[PDB]
Amino acid sequence: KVKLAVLSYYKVDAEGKVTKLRRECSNPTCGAGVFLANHKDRLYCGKCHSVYKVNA
């Protein structure tokens, strides 16, 4: 199971600035706040089901 998944998705430094380590979805329909599920070979969108390259 995943517990406090929001904790890992968003990182805060000592200054308090928020940094996103997980890429946003390119699909405009999904909107912001949607992060792609990360895997070595490719990066995957849960909501749209699209497949993106990790390099991109």
Partner: protein, 120 residues
């Protein structure tokens, strides 16, 4: 009329128009999208980085969103409507909410005016 009582009705009015994002994952999604007009955060959250994240997102320079502190997550969940009502009418089986974000006020009430006036 206290500030806490003002939020109690305001959250209920936001519920009627489906204008609340309930929970961290929904709250951060609202904040990153710029859909957040107000953030209600619990001070007694066990994990500190939860407080840091919501405070950082609420204080982002591009989209500054007002933030409120709540003593207990359980009462915030009750205002968010998570809890159910018993035969006596008291809230039963209530679920705690660490953070609640308002996407739509729904109706303009005098209690909304005090909250924005307090922030201004």
């Amino acid at each position: 009329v206290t500030i806490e009582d003002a939020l109690k009705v305001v959250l209920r009015t936001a519920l009627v128009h489906d204008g609340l994002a309930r929970g961290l994952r929904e709250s951060t999604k609202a904040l990153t999208r710029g859909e957040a007009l107000l953030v209600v955060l619990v001070s007694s959250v066990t994990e500190a980085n939860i407080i840091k994240l919501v405070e950082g997102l609420a204080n982002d320079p591009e989209n500054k969103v007002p933030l409120i502190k709540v003593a207990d997550a359980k009462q915030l969940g009750e205002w968010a409507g998570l809890g159910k009502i018993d035969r006596e009418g008291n809230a039963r089986k209530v679920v705690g909410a660490s953070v609640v974000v308002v996407k739509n006020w729904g109706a303009e009430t005098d209690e909304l005016s005090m909250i924005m006036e307090h922030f201004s």
